[PDB]
Amino acid sequence: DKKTIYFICTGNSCRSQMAEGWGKEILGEGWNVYSAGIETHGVNPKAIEAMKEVDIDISNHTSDLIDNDILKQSDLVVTLCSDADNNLPILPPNVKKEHWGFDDPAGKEWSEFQRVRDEIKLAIEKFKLR
Ligand SMILES: [Cl-]
Ligand SMILES: [K+]
């Protein structure tokens, strides 16, 4: 019954972790939500803190490599970063792919972490109402 959305960004540390957090909160009733990257850089504490400000707990999340099994049965794969698409294999027709680009908040102002977090929320809300 539930469909599957896969948020992809190299590192699975910041943008994709926020997407997974918002995805579970907003899309949870009709979607299984996952996030991954071609390589793992660890869940950034600033991403955990950014989600904590808006009452979303992402402290139990893990920084995961892309899983072949989850990828093949995904209804929608969403790349969120500049090099994420280049690091994906050819996806079969049952899997849809979209690019929702967001700026990298790594090493930037706190207002930028908040902006990117909120832009991701807006994109996921727009997705739910398609
Ligand atoms: Cl990320
Ligand atoms: K993850």
From Swiss-Prot:
GO terms for molecular function: arsenate reductase (thioredoxin) activity; metal ion binding; protein tyrosine phosphatase activity. Optimum pH is 8. GO terms for cellular component: cytoplasm. Changing N12A: Loss of K(+) stabilization over Na(+). Its EC number is 1.20.4.4. Induction: Induced by arsenate [As(V)], arsenite [As(III)], and antimonite [Sb(III)]. Changing N86V: In strain: SW18, SW4, SW24 and SW1. Disruption phenotype: Deletion of the gene leads to a complete loss of arsenate resistance, but does not affect arsenite or antimony resistance. Disulfide bonds join C9-C81, C81-L88. It is found in: Cytoplasm. GO terms for biological process: response to arsenic-containing substance. It catalyses: arsenate + [thioredoxin]-dithiol + H(+) = arsenite + [thioredoxin]-disulfide + H2O. K(+) binds at N12, S35, T62, D64. Keywords: Arsenical resistance, Cytoplasm, Disulfide bond, Metal-binding, Oxidoreductase, Plasmid, Potassium, Redox-active center. Potassium binding stabilizes the enzyme and increases its specific activity. Activity is also stimulated by sulfate. Inhibited by arsenite (mixed inhibitor). Belongs to the low molecular weight phosphotyrosine protein phosphatase family. Thioredoxin-coupled ArsC subfamily. NCBIfam families: arsC_pI258_fam (TIGR02691), PRK13530.1 (NF010053). Catalyzes the reduction of arsenate [As(V)] to arsenite [As(III)]. In vitro, also has low phosphatase activity with para-nitrophenyl phosphate (pNPP) as substrate. This is Arsenate reductase. It comes from Staphylococcus aureus.
